[PDB]
Design a protein around this ligand. Structure first.
Ligand SMILES: [Mg+2]
Ligand SMILES: [Zn+2]
Length: 259
């Protein structure tokens, strides 16, 4: 009898069961290829090439260097969860209701209104979730990627791994809001981060105020950085973010930014 998917015990269950049938080198090779394909096919729903690359780098690095991630992934493949190669990626955002910002839509946002608000009143929020589309195909929506070498990068990577773990292990977050338990999804993601040398803050609970503040500020900064990357194409940037947030396809070739 397995632990419930929302209890901390579920994390160790997943790893124990996952280690029983390890990915062969050929198995891993094929998973590696499926992820590359999946991420490449995610372009039409990601904000920019940088984010495409970073998602790819992050998942592939985790597969290459983290036994925990490989165990979680193998668990999913052999125990009727999501095969990681089936997962596509998106950068869906949502207007913040409390914001004083006066805009009808994400498309209308400007770099300015993004920088004229600190955490608490920021104009938009990323949607970070493991969901499924109409055809029941799994996707992960997550923050745009922060700049290479940014403070935000390891936390962003750990958070991305977190969402994938939902899919590939079927793990949940804690049922109630807690300051002392992380839940099995976050537990696993933290182990992966530790194995890969991603420096993330040592939080105790999934809903700890410091954790909530950290995430919000990471997201705001990742978004500011992403916008600044496309400073010359400001309208194109927010229009694409809106297109994706409305659940439409944008150019898989990012022609909106083209020289
Ligand atoms: Mg709208
Ligand atoms: Zn979660």
């Amino acid at each position: 009898i397995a632990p419930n998917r929302a209890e901390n015990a579920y994390a160790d269950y997943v790893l124990d069961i996952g280690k029983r049938i390890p990915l062969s080198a050929a198995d891993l090779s094929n998973v590696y290829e499926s992820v590359i394909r999946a991420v490449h096919d995610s372009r039409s729903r990601l904000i920019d090439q940088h984010t495409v690359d970073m998602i790819g780098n992050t998942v592939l690095d985790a597969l290459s260097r983290s036994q925990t991630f490989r165990d979680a992934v193998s668990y999913g493949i052999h125990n009727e969860k999501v095969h990681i190669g089936c997962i596509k990626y998106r950068n869906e955002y949502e207007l913040n209701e409390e914001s004083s910002v006066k805009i009808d839509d994400i498309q209308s946002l400007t770099c300015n209104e993004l920088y004229e608000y600190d955490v608490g009143q920021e104009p938009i929020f990323p949607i970070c979730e493991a969901g499924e589309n109409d055809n029941e195909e799994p996707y992960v929506s997550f923050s745009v990627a922060p700049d290479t070498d940014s403070y935000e990068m390891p936390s962003w990577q750990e958070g991305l791994i977190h969402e994938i773990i939902h899919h590939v292990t079927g793990s949940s977050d804690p049922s109630g809001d807690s300051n002392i338990e992380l839940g099995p999804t976050e537990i696993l993601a933290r182990r992966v981060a530790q194995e890969l040398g991603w420096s993330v803050p040592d939080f105790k609970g999934y809903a700890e105020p410091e954790r909530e503040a950290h995430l919000r500020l990471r997201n705001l900064n990742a978004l500011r950085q992403a916008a600044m990357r496309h400073e010359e194409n400001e309208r194109a940037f927010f229009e694409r973010l809106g297109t994706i947030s409305d659940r439409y396809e944008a150019s898989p070739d990012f022609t909106e930014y083209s020289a």
